[PDB]
Design a protein around this ligand. Structure first.
Ligand SMILES: O=C(NC[C@H]1O[C@H](O[C@H]2O[C@H](CO)[C@@H](O)[C@H](O)[C@H]2O)[C@H](O)[C@@H](O)[C@@H]1O)c1ccccc1
Length: 434
């Protein structure tokens, strides 16, 4: 029958393709979900979607939106409210057995405009064979990096922050964790330098950024434009400390089996032969997973995101993907139905274990079978309970562009002056000027 188009980031194409096929198996030819890939960066995903929406592309049905786009897609009319479900089942499905942080990312003006499907929070990833204890705060991060440098060991502090969204996420985590915030509650005012407490928070966050930027043996990938990967940097042994979304767990196990991790030769274990499936996805059996994980644990460990205020955990910036139905769709009923099918318990288990994307279903974090395969469940749920959030605003696109342009390169940050420049550019963004 009809085709429901499902637009997702390209790096999550395969995963969602698999999920879509599963859901296609449960409709009996009544309709078919077809996944379509968007670019890699949140901004370009947004741009493609916005062009199809303003272009009245009536073939656009379901969209996997980054959490930061809700405000814009709701205010524009692009994302239909879940209350526009003809069957009226969308809102109840979205809130049922779903963590409250994701649900908050999916809302605007007291209405849900999307159903969360995946969430995200960044953890610390370290080489337990080179680091006897994972640092619990950022000055400890810097000290460990310097000490590793004073031993020929890899000294990078791999953070996925080039000159875009990831850098803004780093800054927002540091700022909120320092007690600050980019915008007021209502999003109408800039709160980076408007009180001494807020200014102090911004200055501290900028100071951490600069100190990581200029720490002995730091990244020479910060001082230019090339979209480098902190994940691959860690997997290539160039870094013994990384902060990154938890998909790097799956990747590390997968690429180590494909032979792509020098310090973790899972490819040389006979029992893991064939654990890669015909589409290239690491799909171990239970015993194969025990083998791979217990071998990984000698060179790969995870820990909470490093705090800024020692003695209390950080407020880590939440990310992820919410399923929205485009206002262009021709079959609202089937779009919302497909949304409900894409986020069910089975496909959530899959999107987490195979796809590396944290699920939004709370039951899974209380599920022992899931916890045994996702050993980072407790820290992820705890950081999502305590999560920092980026400002929900219809002008987040321009806001993030301006903030990123000011923050990069982080080697040129001067905390006070940079704080003032940041507040001024954010003011420009929320003034509807660029
Ligand atoms: O952090 C980076 N960009 C900001 C977004 O990060 C995540 O999304 C990105 O990573 C996930 C993997 O967990 C992919 O699935 C997404 O497609 C990708 O956009 C957060 O989920 C999202 O909320 C943030 O907006 C980043 C990291 C590394 C290199 C470049 C950019």
């Amino acid at each position: 029958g009809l085709v429901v188009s499902f637009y997702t980031p390209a790096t999550d194409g395969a995963t969602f393709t698999a999920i879509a096929q599963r859901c296609n198996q449960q409709f009996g030819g009544r309709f078919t979900i077809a996944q379509v890939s968007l670019p890699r960066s949140p901004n370009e995903q947004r741009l493609q979607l916005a062009r199809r929406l303003t272009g009245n592309d009536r073939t656009l049905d379901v969209m996997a939106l980054d959490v930061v786009w809700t405000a814009e897609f709701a205010e524009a009319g692009w994302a239909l409210p879940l209350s526009d479900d003809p069957a009226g089942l969308a809102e109840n499905d979205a809130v049922a057995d779903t963590l409250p942080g994701p649900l908050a990312t999916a809302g605007w003006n007291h209405k849900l405009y999307a159903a969360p499907v995946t969430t995200n929070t960044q953890l610390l990833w370290y080489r337990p064979d080179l680091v006897n204890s994972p640092p619990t705060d950022w000055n400890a991060m810097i000290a460990e990096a310097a000490r590793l440098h004073a031993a020929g060991e890899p000294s990078w502090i791999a953070v996925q922050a080039n000159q875009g969204e990831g850098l803004v996420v780093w800054f927002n985590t540091l700022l909120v964790s320092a007690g600050g915030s980019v915008l007021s509650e209502d999003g109408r005012h800039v709160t980076l330098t408007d009180t001494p407490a807020h200014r102090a928070a911004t200055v501290s966050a900028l100071q951490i950024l600069k100190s990581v930027a200029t720490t002995p043996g730091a990244d020479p990938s910060i001082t230019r434009t090339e979209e480098g990967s902190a994940r691959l940097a860690f997997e290539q042994g160039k870094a013994a400390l990384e902060v990154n979304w938890p998909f790097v767990f799956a990747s590390m196990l997968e690429n180590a089996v494909k032979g792509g991790v020098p310090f973790l030769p899972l490819n040389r274990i006979p029992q893991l032969a064939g654990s890669i499936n015909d589409i290239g996805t690491f799909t171990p059996s239970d015993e194969q997973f025990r083998i791979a994980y217990d071998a990984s644990q000698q060179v790969f460990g995870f820990a909470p995101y490093p705090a800024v205020a020692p003695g209390q955990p950080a407020k880590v910036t939440i990310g992820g993907l919410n399923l929205a139905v485009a206002k262009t769709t021709r079959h609202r009923a089937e779009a919302f139905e497909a949304v409900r099918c894409l986020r069910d318990q089975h496909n959530q288990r899959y999107v987490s274990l195979e796809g590396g994307l944290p699920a939004v279903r709370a039951s899974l974090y209380s599920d022992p079978q899931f916890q045994a395969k996702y050993p980072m469940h407790a820290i992820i749920r705890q950081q999502l309970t305590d999560a920092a959030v980026r400002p929900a605003t219809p002008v987040y696109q321009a806001l993030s562009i301006r903030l990123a342009a000011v923050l990069s390169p982080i080697t040129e940050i001067d905390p006070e002056s940079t704080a003032d420049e940041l507040a001024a550019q954010a003011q420009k963004a929320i003034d509807g000027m660029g």
